[PDB]
Write a protein that binds this ligand. Structure first.
Ligand SMILES: NC(=O)c1ccc[n+]([C@@H]2O[C@H](COP(=O)([O-])OP(=O)(O)OC[C@H]3O[C@@H](n4cnc5c(N)ncnc54)[C@H](OP(=O)(O)O)[C@@H]3O)[C@@H](O)[C@H]2O)c1
Lengths: 329, 327, 327, 329, 329, 327
């Protein structure tokens, strides 16, 4: 109970959606000694510092592309949550090397810095877009995930543990559908923009993911890809609940966009382990000091899966009717 | 076409490289063919076996931007075949694969723009479509960089394209070859990872050929995919081993049962031709291109909504006897 | 002037950037306006609010020389407004401010010379005159690099100048704005660091305007300083808060009571004009320039020996009522 | 008494004016175990090695712009005196990036290397030109000073202490006024070069600064800017003492040159602390482990100053008539 | 006896001639805990892994030009054998910077990484071509040798020992004379290619050098250049034994090629120490913690040499008639 | 020749540098002479002693590729004399010597090709022939890089050559000078490392002269070696000290008894001329050159099979009296 007290925590990209929520959640429910925000923008950092005004907060201006900076930033840290990233899919397609340096090289430097300072546990934030990806963004994340899982071999001094938490779309996420679908029904417009008519997506909220990351910390062994069992949803209904009775047009599919987001690839189901509310995709490689992922640090037992499993926002065992959506801003 | 043209090929000492060089020397009027790779052993041996004035050997690494800037001086066409492709080794040495495949792509691109190369073609892999293993992910990033490189318009308009296809028959240290050592060593059985395991098949010479056709029709920005046949590994074993039992083992670190060539989610960007496909860019260039009409004036048509080129839902297959014919 | 010209502005998503872009789109025939900054969030939002074909968004960092070399290809004019300007945060993250403000200046300069840009203007600050805080020191180094860059004469003669002025009224997260939240939140008092605290005032639009005039008259090597009015913070509080007491607090980490625009020690290098000043270079270029006569044929005269443009010994002031008028 | 015995000392730019004098002063008056000279030029190093021929001397060829080199050079060092620099003001104006890489980046690498090797104390040499500067040289030094003072936060392992010692013009300093004013009155020339007629400067000697640095070591807490109370002087008299009865011309003010050098800025007087023979400008930032700069390591008590103080070679409470000057070569 | 058990060994360029042989020799005759192969090519690594299939083998894909990679690769290593190199003389002449980055910079990074991880002993492979060299290859190796010998000064934490083993031509070495002279007499060709008629070379076999390296490990103090007393041979006879009765032509001298390879330079004989079967060329510099190279770690006593000595494949006290050659493939 | 030409010399503040600059200013119509070195002290002093408009001083390090790219803009000829030459100090600081001598060579070369310099001459040393000490080894690598640089043929054909010769009489801090302090300080004896110690001798002015002739005759790829006399150190001591005993000490860290100029193993690549030698490249360039005929139409002949230019088997010697004449 409370396996995070007196710990110093560093979170890259702490000024973002997840970052701000996660930090709030840690200051409010744990006796963590210190929380360090690591990000580049001075504007967002000065405002987040006023927004929080907490003595246990520390802010480091820095780029994850900068190995030397991370080395100093992680000095004394026990836990690192890595959320820094360039996630705008269509912008990543026009600015590929940018997305690559931040997400892939960024992951490398963070891993490097965490080993040098002997951090204890590291959780990297992945995305559903990183499974059987088609867009660059998702490919960088897949590479990112691979680096973090692979980092569990290096048994130098202390044994830093690296795990990955993968989930998708976050409701109302700044710049997402909800925010725009809230400016449509609102600012009179008799036509709701729609890409496809079969378009669906996994949906989870900021707080759910945050809470999920914390629980993942409490049970990780290191090497896991944690996937939460979340409900699917068709964009048609997100345009009915968040849009009473208004017509809809069609602008076709956007760049490197899927119709359905995979969560647990059919090609890797033989590695997945089911649990009551989450999954564990085991390493596709073998470590020197292997672990049994069937028994979390929280004794939660895991079951294997059908050799033809494919967790997708398409064949999910649960959905969310319109009215449910409205039950959240 | 290539007469009086200087061509540089990274990874020139590899399986594709040697076949490509051999084919260029014999069928074009290329003035100079440059091999750019790291091994002095392979290059001296490739120099002895290719004793031709048209060759020139450069020792260099694609991870070295300065070296490439220098090697690409005066080059008209660049074929990028340098890579780390061993999937398992890539899972264990992930950063090495990333440095070579992704940063290497970026450097090659940089050096080509600076030296004002006319055309560039990077070799992709079917493992880059909806990838699940690291190697494939790095190639997908590579392909993306190359397609994206076409938004530059400084000195001369450098064109970048990608040629994607799967496993090459007999390929230096692959299934078929080392499999023959099996049915040749009296082996009481043949190793088979799975029964429903299928794969696309193309010969080393066909790929080289396809790369050369792609050069003749490219506008810059395409991912050329050749129409090739699939094949169940069930029959590949019962080809090199007509009479031998199979040791149904398991799946390797990052293998898939079926390799994708053109994803369903990208189908809409596809265009069918008689012999191949073109997956259109996902981005809009400062200057539009009409990929429905090649430089060879070939017309291509869109594909059905939920189309997909997989090694399992393919209509062209290669049975036992059909194999031998190659090697 | 700017018709059919390509303009690139670093830090294009900032307060100055957006105003400058808006002003360029509306008043010139610029063919293409390029925003170069790091945040995808701000750029996508700035793209939605500026839905114009003349725009182009590049994700990049000024600390990245390779990225700039690429972004500046084909650019005619470069406005450098990228920076880390939060003084306190600069005192705590000194190396970050140095990397962005100084190394960033050096890279921008390098990329401009290589791409043969015609004119470049970097935004300085009054905190760079006789500086006492790190941020200001980095800008002074920046300004020096830019002025010095004019000794190059390779391909095309690239001109580098500097535009220096102080605090911008209402500026995203500054005194005035957040101060209104005060007199708006019934606050029983207004935070005042000191009583004799004065500062120069200029509007976001005036600065943008001044930058554009500077482009029209620059020879390359000047530090253009606009004639703007000072203002006691005593009256700024008694403007947004006609009836509210002041919480006379203390001085922030690296604040000064009065900001200098033109130092006394540099007075001799100054030249007065009707609307502004030009602080002449401190070095002699391979090719002399006569800064007493702009490209707009405006004549400027020297100033008195021990002259000095301070926010305290200024003859132009902005009283309470005078403020509101802006925001 | 003698809080420097058995210590290994490294001094960057040890082949310079201060360097050579400081090294002499340390070999002669302390039982320091070893003194390492860190600089680039082989000529000056081979000659300094013959000039000293001391077994406790070590010479490392290296550039302060080279982080890897410093890392190895500082291995085993207890104290680092940082005197390497590009100080020629007019040359720094024509070669700005050069001055920036050596003085600013140089300071960074030295700080980095000192932390990695867990040095105990570090003293950086500043200049009066770094206060309310106008020339690039002075701006780089101001940046340099800022980095060294800011380095006292990092409480990793050991607590390396970083302080700055700032003073100005050194009499007869190679290439200074004295050396030229000694070639004038000498090599017949009926005209002494003069910039301004109100020109003044703070004056101190090599030995005084050196001794001042050593004493600063004995009392520093880390984070201080030590300023010695030194006498001012008008260039007119330096042209009378060092020049009997000879006329004088005027070549105006040189590049980025001041008429008067500030030592303690009016804008920062509220941070200064007076002592019997020196001042302490406290950090403009707050550290995690704050110190009371009113009581040196040598118990010397400090007094605050008038909120309108401005220590300048203009309003100094002491000057140096011609005859005094002659009392020194 | 067996001063190598339970040790973790890393060998750069382990996929080469020496590498493969050395690894075989270590797995077969020592209780070394682990052997790490460090090299770039995935092809040669996957095949060497099948060729050995030993659990005590580890393979790291990496470049010696990459300092960060070596740092991680040497983590936990006790002994490093450095055999990675670009040795093709004529290719090094056309690709000089390539040879320089691999051999010289490569040596530096390996030394750097070995110090950071506190390895115990390091042996670098040199060549006879590095003594009084004329070709670039040999010059890089000379530089390489110099770095490794010079690395014995740094007395940071543990005292890593660096020695160099220098010998020349290896019989039948892939791509050497034997392999081609085996394709001549073989594949009918009435003319054997010959450069000069006085051409001679030192000859040793793969196994001899390997064994020599291991024994060098057992007796090194650190700082030595070990040279084995090996037999000379004239290329004329290598063309009689490996070529019964066939004529011979002359293609003159190839690029940067010598007629005779020096082993122990006349200019350095005063540093050499003779032993029953090997020599020791002492450091041309003095270390802080000097050693007596006259008494190996194996008590083997060494004798000085004549101040006019010149060990060359020209004045050797032993040769190898044709028939002897045939006694080896 | 050099009229209206811009010349840049690295290590321009050194013994060779100053003499070379002085000689260029006085005997050519060079439009601009650029000194590129690191010390501000030496450069300001060299500026005061050389108060000439034709000079220009750049502070820079040869280890800095970016700095060189900039300094070499607009340069026609480059003389590379920057180096770390103190043999003992090189043995103790091996990586520093390597960075300056080898990487420095590579950067100078890179910057020259990019800025399209016409001719480049790097100063080598006799310690680079069959070297035994680190300094010499680094120079041999340097020479190799320079000779090899001639295989480039991008924009303009840049020519790279090498000038090699030994110890310079009186040289700032060498044998002769500091030796005079001896016979001047009444010293009861003179330090002599060995009795059979010989060395080549050339004056500072002769070397400079030889470099200028080399520029006039070079094709690019040569190592010019001047015919200079040897000298026993036995007589050099009995010159500055007619009446003084010798303290027969020992050999320094990396000394040789006799310095080689042209190795026996390279003899075959040599060519004799009236006043000098040319050691031909060891590699074949994309475009052959006939080094038997200079640009000054001088004819050179091969040398005897086992020829070798050593300071011991030389036929030209400098006796006691012969020395004084210089210094
Ligand atoms: N050749 C002789 O007869 C001989 C005689 C005496 C001494 N030696 C010395 O002994 C050493 C080994 O010689 P060898 O005969 O075993 O030659 P080899 O068969 O060419 O082995 C060299 C190995 O080094 C690896 N390598 C090359 N560049 C590398 C780099 N940049 N980073 C990491 N690994 C690299 C190569 O593996 P990858 O291609 O997979 O990178 C190659 O397998 C050499 O240093 C040589 O100087 C050789």
């Amino acid at each position: 109970q409370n396996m995070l007290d007196n710990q110093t925590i560093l979170i890259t990209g702490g000024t973002g959606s997840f970052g701000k929520c996660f930090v709030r959640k840690v200051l409010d429910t744990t006796n963590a000694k210190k929380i360090i925000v690591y990000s580049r923008d001075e504007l967002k950092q000065s405002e987040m510092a006023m927004e929080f005004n907490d003595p246990r907060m520390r802010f480091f201006i820095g780029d994850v592309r900068d190995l030397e900076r991370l080395n100093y930033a992680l000095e004394g840290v026990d836990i690192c949550i890595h959320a820094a990233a360039l996630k705008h899919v269509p912008i990543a397609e026009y600015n590929p090397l940018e997305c690559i340096k931040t997400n892939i090289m960024g992951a490398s430097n963070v891993i490097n810095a965490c080993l040098k300072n002997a951090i204890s546990q590291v959780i990297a934030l992945s995305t559903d877009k990183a499974a059987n990806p088609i867009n660059l963004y998702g490919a960088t994340k897949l590479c990112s995930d691979k680096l973090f899982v692979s980092a569990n071999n290096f048994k130098g001094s202390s044994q830093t543990q690296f795990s990955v938490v993968r989930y998708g779309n976050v409701v109302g996420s700044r710049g997402s559908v909800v925010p725009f679908f809230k400016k449509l029904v609102q600012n009179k417009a008799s036509e709701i923009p729609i890409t496809d008519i079969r378009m669906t997506r996994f949906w989870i909220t900021l707080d759910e993911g945050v809470s999920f990351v914390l629980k993942s910390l409490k049970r990780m062994h290191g090497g896991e890809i944690f996937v939460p069992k979340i409900p699917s949803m068709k964009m048609t209904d997100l345009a009915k609940a968040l849009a009473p009775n208004t017509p809809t047009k069609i602008i076709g599919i956007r760049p490197g966009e899927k119709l359905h987001e995979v969560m647990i690839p059919k090609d890797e189901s033989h590695l997945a382990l089911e649990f009551e509310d989450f999954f564990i995709i085991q390493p596709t490689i073998s470590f020197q000091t292997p672990k049994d992922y069937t028994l979390t640090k929280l004794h939660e037992k895991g079951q294997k899966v059908a050799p033809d499993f494919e967790y997708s926002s398409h064949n999910n065992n649960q959905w969310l009717e319109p009215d449910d959506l409205l039950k959240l801003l």
